[PDB]
Amino acid sequence: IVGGYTCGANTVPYQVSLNSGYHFCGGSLINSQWVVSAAHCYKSGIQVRLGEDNINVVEGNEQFISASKSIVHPSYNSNTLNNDIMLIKLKSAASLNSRVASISLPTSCASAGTQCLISGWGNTKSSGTSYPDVLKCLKAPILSDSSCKSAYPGQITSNMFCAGYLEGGKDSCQGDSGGPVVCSGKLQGIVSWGSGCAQKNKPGVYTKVCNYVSWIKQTIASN
Numbered sequence: 001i002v003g004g005y006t007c008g009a010n011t012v013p014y015q016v017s018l019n020s021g022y023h024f025c026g027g028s029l030i031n032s033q034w035v036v037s038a039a040h041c042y043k044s045g046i047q048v049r050l051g052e053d054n055i056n057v058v059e060g061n062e063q064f065i066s067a068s069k070s071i072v073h074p075s076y077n078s079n080t081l082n083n084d085i086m087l088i089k090l091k092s093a094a095s096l097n098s099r100v101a102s103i104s105l106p107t108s109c110a111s112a113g114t115q116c117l118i119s120g121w122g123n124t125k126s127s128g129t130s131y132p133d134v135l136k137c138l139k140a141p142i143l144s145d146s147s148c149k150s151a152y153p154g155q156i157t158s159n160m161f162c163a164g165y166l167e168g169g170k171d172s173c174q175g176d177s178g179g180p181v182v183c184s185g186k187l188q189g190i191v192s193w194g195s196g197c198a199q200k201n202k203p204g205v206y207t208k209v210c211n212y213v214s215w216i217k218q219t220i221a222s223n
């Protein structure tokens with residue numbers, strides 16, 4: 001997360017670290033057996049780590065649960081990054097308490113102007129590299145569709161929204177990918193892509209979760 005602050009241990013109870021030997025992406029717990037992440041984070045052999053804060057030190061609140069199956073959106077396109085959303089079913093139900101909890105899915109889409117919390121263990125530098133060991137947090141407003149389409153001409157589909165700062169210096173980044181964008185206690189987005197990180201006039205782009213609620217509920221009821 002570039003230009004963010006340390007969240008503090010287990011203050012973001014729905015945040016998950018996806019690990020295949022090393023933390024590679026984040027994700028969000030939506031019920032005790034299912035995680036939502038980004039389809040660009042797909043790989044085989046994912047272990048979901050819940051209850052994390054320092055991802056390099058076992059501190060007492062972790063649950064590491066292997067996934068049973070991963071489902072990429074039927075219409076995911078990796079070249080345009082449209083429909084960048086994937087479901088991960090866990091092998092056992094997780095145990096939910098205040099430090100590990102699920103987040104609600106949206107009933108209504110969020111308007112531009114709404115301030116959201118974005119969090120993850122991705123890169124913290126705009127130039128160069130530095131990956132933190134403890135979870136970072138960023139508050140950022142959803143931008144209007146016209147600032148977003150004017151920053152990324154020809155790239156924004158109806159399933160994408162921008163959030164962040166046009167002046168730069170504060171953004172999500174590589175590694176926060178698949179992580180949560182929470183606004184008024186509902187999951188509204190998934191960290192998806194951007195041009196670099198924290199560049200002037202290049203805000204973060206996020207998968208618009210309210211467009212996916214019926215696919216998520218139907219998939220969960222049948223799998």
Ligand SMILES: [Ca+2]
Binds near residue numbers: 052054055056059
């Ligand atoms: Ca840990």
